């Protein structure tokens, strides 16, 4: 019943300009310091701004004047605008809310909104579907897609364990990621298996279902 | 810019077995007009964003674990992990809010200690799709192990690889291996291997196929 | 002619 959400994030070319937004719900908006807090792609975090009750603002040195912490008691929301960008600046960024009632304490955290701030343009993804005992297992592969974040999921989001999504290795300015999951023999063919894909920049959502290799030649 | 510091970046625990993190500062964080110390903990479970573990250098956080405990003052605190879980695998950081240009320590991650096993191996020839629109792609999967080193292969040279974050419920990692091709490269050839070579396999296991247009 | 798919 403390819920934060981030928004808005995804990729811009270095120079530009992005205002992440950070939806809260479940206490008085007002009366709680929060903050904004990036994960560099090392895994090290990194505190960019904190705002008070009395919306005083501050900010960690690299990113002063650029970066802008500003809050909405009237609708709940936190932004974080976020222009003239650098490489630096390509890191996982959350919003957080003061742990008690006095101080910008890290307490709840939303579940990160990601910024990649390169040249590359946004292109789609390709989804290949994969498939060949007792118990066997699929697979899928998802080549050639530039933002990071995607979204690969099996049957709707339906499949319990199994399922190993590995994490996305770009080479040459292309993101490749792949994904495995294991049911019964004679769990599949019988029953549909589909590989969805969502990857929200160049809006697509993409299902591709999984259906043994075909005895046809030429 | 007040600089936090963790001792042992990496770490290595078994189940049940003691823990401690250790957190330098540059700086005392203990103000004498409240006799407190700015000083917090969090954990990060992998691909989850952190939650706050300890606070006040002391206090654990409303619903953690009581098998944390955090002690030292001033200049030099500590994480305590009496017995530890398996559901505990992380990384810890700890973050000072006695200053601003607020700061977290570089972080100490913590493997865990398994029986060794062996990993299940599954080849998968490029799609039907991938070919047609030019370039075609194998792959084999390497599933649930304890270690994580392991050599997975006949001229390999543009392959690529990646591996889970082990599994915090049972304690495993897997691996990916996307060797990559074009269309007419992949109809050339025939000799598609995929062999292991873990600290349980000098003797291998493997998993081939020969070409489905043959 | 798929040589094997099970």
């Known amino acids: 019943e403390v819920q934060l959400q981030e928004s808005g994030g995804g990729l811009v070319k270095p120079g530009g300009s992005l205002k992440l937004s950070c939806a809260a719900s479940?206490?008085?908006?007002?009366?709680?310091?929060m903050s904004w807090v990036r994960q560099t792609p090392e895994k090290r975090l990194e505190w960019v701004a904190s705002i008070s009750t009395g919306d005083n603002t501050y900010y960690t040195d690299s990113v002063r004047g650029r970066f802008t912490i500003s809050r909405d008691n009237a609708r709940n929301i936190l932004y974080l605008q976020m222009s003239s960008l650098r490489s630096e600046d390509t890191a996982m960024y959350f919003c957080?809310?003061?742990?008690?009632?006095?101080?910008?304490?890290?307490?709840?955290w939303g579940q990160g909104t990601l910024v990649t701030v390169s040249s590359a343009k946004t292109t789609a993804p390709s989804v290949y579907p994969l498939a060949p005992g007792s118990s066997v297992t699929l697979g899928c592969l998802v080549k050639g897609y530039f933002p990071e974040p995607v979204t690969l999921t099996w049957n709707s989001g339906s499949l319990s364990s199994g399922v190993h999504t590995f994490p996305a290795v770009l080479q040459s300015d292309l993101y490749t990621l792949s994904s495995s999951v294991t049911v019964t023999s004679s769990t599949w063919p019988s029953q549909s298996i589909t590989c969805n894909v969502a990857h929200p920049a160049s809006s697509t959502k993409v299902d591709k279902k999984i259906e043994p290799r075909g005895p046809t030649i030429k | 810019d007040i600089v936090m510091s963790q001792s042992p970046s990496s770490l290595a625990v078994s189940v049940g077995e003691k823990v401690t993190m250790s957190c330098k500062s540059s700086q005392s964080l203990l103000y004498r007009g409240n006799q407190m110390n700015y000083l917090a903990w969090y954990q990060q479970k992998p691909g989850q964003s952190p939650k706050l573990l300890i606070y006040?250098?002391?206090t654990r956080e409303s619903g953690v674990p009581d098998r944390f405990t955090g002690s030292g003052s001033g200049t030099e605190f500590t994480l305590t992990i009496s017995s530890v879980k398996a559901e505990d695998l992380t990384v810890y950081y700890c973050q000072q809010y006695y200053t601003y240009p607020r700061t977290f320590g570089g972080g100490t991650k913590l493997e865990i200690k398994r029986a060794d096993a062996a990993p299940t191996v599954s080849i998968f020839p490029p799609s039907s799709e991938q070919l047609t629109s030019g370039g075609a792609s194998v792959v084999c999967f390497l599933n649930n192990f304890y270690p994580k080193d392991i050599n997975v292969k006949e001229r390999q040279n543009g392959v690529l690889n990646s591996w889970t974050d082990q599994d915090s419920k049972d304690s495993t990692y897997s691996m990916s291996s996307t060797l990559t091709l074009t269309k007419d490269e992949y109809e050339r050839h025939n000799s598609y291997t995929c062999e292991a070579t873990h600290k349980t396999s000098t003797s291998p296991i493997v998993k081939s196929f020969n070409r489905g247009e043959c | 002619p798929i040589y094997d798919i099970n």
């Open positions: 006040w250098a002391s």
């Open positions: 957080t809310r003061g742990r008690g009632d006095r101080g910008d304490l890290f307490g709840y």
């Open positions: 479940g206490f008085t908006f007002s009366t709680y310091a």
